[PDB]
Design a protein around this ligand. Structure first.
Ligand code: MG
Ligand code: ZN
Ligand code: ZN
Lengths: 109, 1270
DNA sequence: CGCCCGCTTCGGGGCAACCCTGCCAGTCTAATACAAATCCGGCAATGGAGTCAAGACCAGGTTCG
DNA sequence: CGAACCTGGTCTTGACTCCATTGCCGGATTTGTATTAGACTGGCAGGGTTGCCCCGAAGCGGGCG
């Protein structure tokens, strides 16, 4: 029916491809844990982030030793959490004693 | 090297990639199986289309939109993370996937021969059990710990089996006690004598099956002990239970894993050097199967040794992702999106990798994790090649998907579909019509098409004439077609050539360059004298108009590809501007002579004078317009502008009759005078009857002696005169003009009686079923011949059907025989003859059954025509890639070697009878030696073109054999010189120093196929030619001799037995398994016993294999054999091909030599290397201690010759792209781009014709004298 | 005694012309419950960006004494 | 020869309007995650017929430490 024609989801602009002056810009250095260095050109008036997902793909921090204490979140839910929220300590300790005397009565008779 | 790929190239070096190369190519790590947010239609973060990883979708805009101009470029937005740049980096930036478990690559595993298998010495049947998690593999073992805890653990084994026997004599003692209980309860009461011992048989059967239990588990323990003693790396422990027991009892002493990480561990623990030298030692000493497998592994082992390639890259750790625009998700108008079928495979890999990562993080049992790693392996295998191993991964509708390997393989890969043959702009097509008023270099062109071809030209020009304010009003003025655009269009067309393709382009003249001119209508008018080159009848054929643009392109079209500069063949040099068909008839009627016609010359006197003389052809034309002179009567004109023939010139003038003033009388017809006025002034008078062969000889002479423009104008004049007298010839077809032979019924009765007697003798049992068919076939062939003979003698000469044939215009005599007379024998669908046969002409009208018999042969012929074409075009496709590198480099090799030519063999009475096939085998060749005879003078010196007059001089002086050069023995390095190639058959002069004569050779060989029928078990047509060029072993193999002597002939059981009796002697060569279905070779008489055979005499009848005649009679005789054997086929179809084309191909066949001895330098035995490299290596290695590598010549077919080339790019683009690509990647075989398809591929300028630096770097300045005068 | 190798057969990948000409493929236990994120709708700090009115200000082309 | 003019802009000044642009701030919606207690325990299932060629794999008859 129609048509065929299609478009990539994005605009194609055309201006002057000038090279003589630009907006001036800095170069920051981020570092992964495993000794990898990466340089990222940020603009001048730009709040440079402390951590940055690098070209390698693992999370990389900045080479300046500030360490802004990101306060990493809790472990989500463990099997200990799903067990503890449906039982109690004296019951689990009772079962622990039962298996303890079970391996005892197995072993030495 | 260049990353943005400016056109500076010296190499193209493929190589097996490593993981540190892959995660250095990438700009990010794709880690989510998402493409586009469903609601905003923008790409996801860390997905398959992320603008952070792959670049922006919008020109100079980030993702959060905080930067939107060019002034922010090269920088990265500190919130969205998308580098602001141009939006064509999504064409080029790649990404990678960090896998959670290692995965083997599929090409180095699955494709036969397997490369992991040859590298590790593993079988593929058992390696598939490793990398698909079906069997364990031992990757390491401790030696000395096994060496002493072998004693300690066999002591422990003895303790264990003694405890087993403690259990076993517990069994013995317990059932002994229960068996004496069976005694004490069976023999202690009242019971039956057998029922008291059924419990005896019961407990004894219990002990039998119980000792079977103990015996089987002791056999299990014995098996596991034998396995731990004979444990070694590269071993496979199948049977899961045994491996688990073996590990948890002997958990030290060895490491052994399962899958691709274990293969990676084996590649880590693998000395290639000692392994390689062990293989060198095995080929130093071994034999048989071991030596062949040692060679086949030494190939890839030395391949990994020589280069700097670690073989660690055969397993894979990080998989890279093709850029987003190469797998684009484009939307159509209406939201129906279009993914590119790789996105689903990457989503499968990303899903399975993330699931593996969460399973390993969560802690999962071994079954689930190994299932997930097998799924990951199959996902990567489907990504690299879907459909390779197992079931192809389907999509919706059960359509197999298109992986990365399916983007290159076959006809629809990038190579054959988009690298070599492209849709082009500035183009158009239309249907064609005949243009008989055009000049030879002109052509028609419909103005409604030219106005769209030349639209930028006409746009510029009618801006320049102030008809438009600017370009946009000019474009709208074009699109509305305001009528002064046509007046501008004439000026932009004039002197600007166009090309005229016609698919299928069989040979070189399918593209020619014509000057266009404007034509009313919408059909391209083609000049009629290029129909023979284009193979273009006017049944509705269509031709494509191209348009050259640059000054170099217009000059190439104007000078090389023009119509009037390409008259002759490229193959045999006969003209293709020759006037054929209709025109020829016209000329025939114009130069034929009718005795007893109106107004002849009779010398009768006494009462009146002769009334035959005419003072001028002007007066003759006036007396022809009045009804006195016929055109075709014999008169005596007095000519003053035409050159008389050589005898009359030497008679009337002797030496220097110059014609524009002189006068001389001649008895000819008026038609021949009007005909000779077409030909130029220097050409002598002809005075014959213009048969088509006569016109061919005239145009060949006039093209060989005069310049080209004279030939073009003469051919145009012949076309005009031929049409104008073809109308007047009165050639019509009416059924009153198809006369039937009057004696036909008597002939049919006389052969009907013989058919009746053969049928009667079959009915009375005197002969079987086949011999009566053969007798009837021969009788009706005799009948067909007699009916055709009576038909031939019945017709007059001015019958138009026989006039068209005997002029030579078209049609053989058999078509007249089938119009009137007898159809004859009509073939079976299988190929035999139907014995009935058809006895009615097509004038009388056939009956029902006769027509139904004729349909068999008609449909068989038409389907055979279709399939052959496909095969002929495919043969041409193979030959072009074979001889793509035979281009003429030097002016002169300056050798002295060269072949001899048969050249008019000796008569038995003793004369020089001319050899009939001289024009294909002797002409257009340059002598290396001289012609001397009876200790006389030289006749033809060294290095002459050797045309017709010097061949006539040699046959006059009386020699038979000349030693002439050839492209077989041109001693230049890369392709032939010029003087070995001789005269270029297209120009008539010597070949240039830029020609691609391999392509011309390949096109002229596989061009005239199609029409190459077969015959009524030797293969005798196009499959015969194909098995010759493929260097196959033929079907009807007839073995040749090996040494002279008399023969040991014997007819064994149901087939033959032939042996050569030697003459020194030696060992008798015995030929046993020769079928009695064959025939013995006849010569001069049949092969009789005790007859003296040659060294390479052909024994039986059939086809000799070229390998055997290479091995017996060397390279020269197999060159003679191949050329003679192909040209035998092409002469059997009556097709003129000069031998130098076949010699170009055979010279490409006989390049390489084989290695039977390594010497001590670099050459694996059985490998095939080039001859020049072989000789240069021996020249290097005679110094530094002398040893020769021993070489023998090989004759290899053209597929293997094309695939074993030096450039991996051409061999990848030809055929078998996967295997060529993978072993080139192993060898790290760097291309040098020096060939001919490669520069076509990468778009730079090819090294042939106007591309080579002898012509591409010409400095062109104005001369100083005209500079000063300017 | 069990041990190994030369021909045979079975299987398996690759290829089989070329122009136009076409145009969009499938299916089921089902919901709550809550929280982070996102977004969007409406005033509310603006001050920057534009707009008009008015005039001061020249210093030169137009006319009277 | 000078007086007076009126008009080319040239530029500024001040007053007023409008309008984007964050900034809270609260409700709507949107997306992710978790949880449902009788028992339920190893797939559908389809195609596939050309012919020829080259090569590599498995096997069977042949002799042998
Ligand atoms: Mg046609
Ligand atoms: Zn952004
Ligand atoms: Zn040469």
């Amino acid at each position: 029916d129609r048509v065929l024609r299609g478009s990539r989801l994005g605009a194609v602009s055309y201006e002057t491809d000038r090279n003589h002056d630009l907006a001036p810009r800095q170069i920051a250095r981020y570092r992964t844990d495993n000794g990898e260095e990466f340089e990222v050109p940020f603009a001048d008036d730009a709040e440079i982030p402390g951590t940055w997902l690098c070209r390698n793909g693992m999370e990389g921090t900045l080479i300046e030793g500030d360490l802004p204490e990101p306060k990493k979140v809790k472990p989500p839910r463990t099997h200990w959490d799903m067990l503890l929220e449906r039982r109690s300590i004296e019951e689990l300790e009772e079962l622990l004693k039962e298996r303890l005397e079970l391996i005892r009565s197995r072993r030495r008779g | 090297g260049a990353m943005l790929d400016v056109n500076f190239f010296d190499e193209l070096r493929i190589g097996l990639a490593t993981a540190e190369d892959i995660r250095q190519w990438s700009y990010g790590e794709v880690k989510k199986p998402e493409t586009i947010n469903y609601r905003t239609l923008k790409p996801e973060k860390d997905g398959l289309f992320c603008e952070k990883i792959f670049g922006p979708t919008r020109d100079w805009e980030c993702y959060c939109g905080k930067y939107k101009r060019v002034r922010f470029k090269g920088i990265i937005c500190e919130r969205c993370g998308v580098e602001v740049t141009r939006a064509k980096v999504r064409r080029e930036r790649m990404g990678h996937i960090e896998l959670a478990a290692p995965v083997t690559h599929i090409w180095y595993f699955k494709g036969v021969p397997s490369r992991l298998g040859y590298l590790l010495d593993l079988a593929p049947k058992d390696l598939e059990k490793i990398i698909y998690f079906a069997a364990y593999v031992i990757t390491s073992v401790d030696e000395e710990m096994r060496h002493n805890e072998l004693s300690t653990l066999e002591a422990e084994m003895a303790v264990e089996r003694k405890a087993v026997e403690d259990q076993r004599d517990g069994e013995l003692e317990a059932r002994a006690q229960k068996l004496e209980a069976d005694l004490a309860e069976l023999e202690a009461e009242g019971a039956k004598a057998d029922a008291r011992r059924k419990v005896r048989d019961g407990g004894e059967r219990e002990m039998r099956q119980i000792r079977d239990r103990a015996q089987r588990e002791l056999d299990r323990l014995e098996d596991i002990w034998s396995t731990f003693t004979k444990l070694a790396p590269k071993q496979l422990i199948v049977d899961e239970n045994l491996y688990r027991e073996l590990v948890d009892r002997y958990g030290e002493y060895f490491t052994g894993a399962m899958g691709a990480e274990s293969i990676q561990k084996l590649i880590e623990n693998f000395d290639i050097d000692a392994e390689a030298e062990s293989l060198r030692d095995v080929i130093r000493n071994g034999k048989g199967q071991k030596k062949l497998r040692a060679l086949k592994r030494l190939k890839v082992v030395a391949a990994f040794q020589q280069s700097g390639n670690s073989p660690m890259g055969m397993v894979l750790d990080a998989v890279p992702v093709i850029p987003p625009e190469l797998r684009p998700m484009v939307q159509l108008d209406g939201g129906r999106f279009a993914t590119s079928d790789l996105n689903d495979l990457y989503r499968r890999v990303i899903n399975r990798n993330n699931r593996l990562k969460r399973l390993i993080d969560l802690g999962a049992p071994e079954i689930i994790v190994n299932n997930e790693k097998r799924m990951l392996q199959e996902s990567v295998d489907a990504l690299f090649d879907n459909g390779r191993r197992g079931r192809p991964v389907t999509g919706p509708g059960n359509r197999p998907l298109k992986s990365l390997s399916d983007l290159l393989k076959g006809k629809q890969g990038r190579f054959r579909q988009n690298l070599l043959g492209k849709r082009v702009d500035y183009s158009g097509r239309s249907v064609i019509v005949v243009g008989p008023q055009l000049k030879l270099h002109q052509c028609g062109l419909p103005k409604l098409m030219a106005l769209e071809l030349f639209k930028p030209f006409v746009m510029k020009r009618l801006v320049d004439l102030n008809h438009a304010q600017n370009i946009k009003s000019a474009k709208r003025m074009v699109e509305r077609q305001r009528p002064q655009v046509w007046d501008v269009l004439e000026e932009v067309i004039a002197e600007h050539p166009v090309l005229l393709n016609r698919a299928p382009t069989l040979h070189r003249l399918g593209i020619q360059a014509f000057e266009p001119m404007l034509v009313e209508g919408k059909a391209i008018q083609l000049h009629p004298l290029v129909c023979e080159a284009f193979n273009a009848d006017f049944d509705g054929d269509q031709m494509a108009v191209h348009l050259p643009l640059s000054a170099e392109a217009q000059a190439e079209a104007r000078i090389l590809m023009l119509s009037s500069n390409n008259i002759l063949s490229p193959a045999s040099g006969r003209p293709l501007a020759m006037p054929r068909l209709d025109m020829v008839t016209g000329l025939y009627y114009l130069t034929t002579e009718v005795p007893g016609d109106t107004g002849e010359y009779q010398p009768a006197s006494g009462d009146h004078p002769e009334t035959g003389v005419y003072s001028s052809p002007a007066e003759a034309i006036m007396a022809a317009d009045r009804g006195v002179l016929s055109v075709r009567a014999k008169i005596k004109v007095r000519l003053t502008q035409l050159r008389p023939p050589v005898e009359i010139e030497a008679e009337l003038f002797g030496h220097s009759g110059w014609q524009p003033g002189d006068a001389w009388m001649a008895e000819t017809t008026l038609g021949r005078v009007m005909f000779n006025e077409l030909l130029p002034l220097g050409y002598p008078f002809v005075n014959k009857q213009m048969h088509k062969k006569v016109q061919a000889a005239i145009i060949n002479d006039l093209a060989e002696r005069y310049p080209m423009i004279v030939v073009a104008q003469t051919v145009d004049k012949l076309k005009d005169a031929g049409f104008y007298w073809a109308t007047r010839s009165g050639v019509t077809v009416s059924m009153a003009d198809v006369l039937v032979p009057p004696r036909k019924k008597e002939i049919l009765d006389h052969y009907e009686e013989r058919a009746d007697k053969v049928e009667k003798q079959f009915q009375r049992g005197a002969l079987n079923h086949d011999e009566r068919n053969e007798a009837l076939v021969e009788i009706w062939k005799e009948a067909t011949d007699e009916v055709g003979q009576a038909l031939r003698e019945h017709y007059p000469d001015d019958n138009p059907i026989i006039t068209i044939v005997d002029s030579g215009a078209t049609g053989n005599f058999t078509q007249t025989r089938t119009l009137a007379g007898m159809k004859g024998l009509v073939t079976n669908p299988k190929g035999e003859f139907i014995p009935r046969p058809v006895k009615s002409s097509f004038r009388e009208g056939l009956t029902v059954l006769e027509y139904f018999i004729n349909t068999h042969g008609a449909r068989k012929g038409l389907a055979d025509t279709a399939l052959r074409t496909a095969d002929s075009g495919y043969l041409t496709r193979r030959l072009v890639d074979v001889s793509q590198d035979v281009i003429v480099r030097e002016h002169d090799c300056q050798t002295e070697r060269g072949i001899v030519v048969e050249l008019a063999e000796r008569a038995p009475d003793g004369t020089l009878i001319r050899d009939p096939y001289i024009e294909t085998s002797a002409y257009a060749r340059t002598l290396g030696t001289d012609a001397v005879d009876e200790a006389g003078n030289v006749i033809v010196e060294r290095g002459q073109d050797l045309g017709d007059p010097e061949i006539d001089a040699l046959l006059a002086a009386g020699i038979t054999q000349v030693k002439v050069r050839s492209v077989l023995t041109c001693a230049t390095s890369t392709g032939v010189c010029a003087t070995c190639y001789g005269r270029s058959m297209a120009t008539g002069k010597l070949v240039d120093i830029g020609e691609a004569v391999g392509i011309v050779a390949a096109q002229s060989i596989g061009e005239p196929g199609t029409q190459l029928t077969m015959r009524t078990d030797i293969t005798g047509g196009l499959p015969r030619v194909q098995e010759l060029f493929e260097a196959r072993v033929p079907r009807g193999k007839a073995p040749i001799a090996d040494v002279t002597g008399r023969v040991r002939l014997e007819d064994g059981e149901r087939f033959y037995k032939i042996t050569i009796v030697p003459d020194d002697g030696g060992e008798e060569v015995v030929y046993d398994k020769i079928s009695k279905r064959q025939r013995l070779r006849v010569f001069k008489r049949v092969l009789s016993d005790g007859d003296h055979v040659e060294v390479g005499q052909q024994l039986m009848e059939g086809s000799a294999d070229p390998h055997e005649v290479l091995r017996v009679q060397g390279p020269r005789e197999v060159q003679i054999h191949l050329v003679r054997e192909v040209q035998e086929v092409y002469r059997a179809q009556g097709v003129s091909i000069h031998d130098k084309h076949i010699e170009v191909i055979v010279r490409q066949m006989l390049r390489r030599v084989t290695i039977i001895d390594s010497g001590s330098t670099e050459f694996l035995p059985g490998s095939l290397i080039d001859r020049a490299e072989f000789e240069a290596e021996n020249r290097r290695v005679v110094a530094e201690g002398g040893e020769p590598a021993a070489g023998r010549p090989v004759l290899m077919g053209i597929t293997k010759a094309s695939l074993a080339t030096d450039s991996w790019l051409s061999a990848a683009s030809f055929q078998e792209t996967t295997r060529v690509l993978t072993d080139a990647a192993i060898n790290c075989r760097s291309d040098k781009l020096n060939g001919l398809k490669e520069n076509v591929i990468i778009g730079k300028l090819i090294p042939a014709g106007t591309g080579i630096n002898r012509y591409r770097n010409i400095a062109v300045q104005p001369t100083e004298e005209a500079r000063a005068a300017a």
